[PDB]
Amino acid sequence: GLTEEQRMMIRELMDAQMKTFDTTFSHFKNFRLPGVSREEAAKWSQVRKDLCSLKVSLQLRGEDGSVWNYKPPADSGGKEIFSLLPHMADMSTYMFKGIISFAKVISYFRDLPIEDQISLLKGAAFELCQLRFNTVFNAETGTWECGRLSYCLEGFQQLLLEPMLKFHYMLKKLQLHEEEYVLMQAISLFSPDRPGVLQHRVVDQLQEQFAITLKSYIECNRPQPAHRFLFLKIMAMLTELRSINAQHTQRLLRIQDIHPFATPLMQELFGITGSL
C-alpha cells in the first residue's frame, strides 16, 4: 500500500545499505589492540566514571580457527582504563566510513549542498553508527557480533541504567525489519536542525518524507496488535538516540581533552581542528 515514490525510496535506501554496510566486517583490518590541580583533576573522576560505565571484553576468531580473548582491567587509578580506546577509535572510524559512503550514495543526500552534507554527517554519524550496531547486537548474550570480532558486556539491572545500552536492548526488542532500520538511518541523517545546516526547509521536507514512508511501511506490513503504535515507538527511540548522541559526544570530548585518541576522521566529525 506504498506509493511508487515510497517503494523507490525504500529500494534506494536498501541499495545504499547493501553496498556500504560490511555486515561481516571482512574489510575491517589493521586495527590496534590493547598492549600485551582541581579543575584539571575533577575531569579525571568524570572520565573514570565515563570509561567504566559499560565495559566490554573482546574476542578475535581467526580465519584458521584460533581465538584470542581480551579481558579488560579494573580501574586501579592509572592509565589502564584507556587500553581499549585505540581499538574503539579504529572500529568507530571504520563504521563512520561506511556511514559516509551510505549518505553520499543516497540521491536525496547527494543533491544537497556540500556544506549541508558535511553538517548532516557531523550531526548524525554517531546515531547511524549505533543504528547499524544494533542489527548485530545479540540481546541474549549481550554481545555485538562483528564478524571475526565480538564485544561482550562484562546483575543486568544496574547495567540497563546506561542510556546507550538501554537503547540497544529496547530497540532490539521491537524486532525491526531491514527496511525499518534503514528508514531510521534516513530520518536521523536528514535531521534539519543539526549545527550548521542551511537548507533547513529542504532537509525538513525530506525527513518528514522518510517518516511518512516508514509510517506507511508499518501500516502495510504489520497488522499485528503487537505492532500498534510501532511507528510512534520508533520515532520516540530516534529522539532518545539523538539525546544519547549528545551525551556521548560530551563524554568523548572529555576523554579526548585528557587522553587524546580520536582518529583524524573522528576529529573531523567532532569539530576538533588540530591546534590547541
Ligand SMILES: Clc1ccccc1C(c1ccccc1)(c1ccccc1)n1ccnc1
Ligand atoms: Cl556501541 C558499541 C559497539 C560495540 C562495542 C562497544 C560499543 C560501545 C561504543 C559506544 C560509542 C561508540 C563506540 C562504541 C558502547 C556500547 C554500549 C554502551 C556503551 C558503549 N563501547 C565503547 C566502549 N565500550 C563500549
Ligand SMILES: C[C@]12CC[C@@H]3c4ccc(O)cc4CC[C@H]3[C@@H]1CC[C@@H]2O
Ligand atoms: C562509550 C564512551 C563514550 C563514547 C566514546 C566514543 C564516542 C564516539 C566514538 O566514535 C568512539 C568512542 C569510543 C569511546 C567511547 C567511550 C568509552 C566509555 C564511554 O561511556
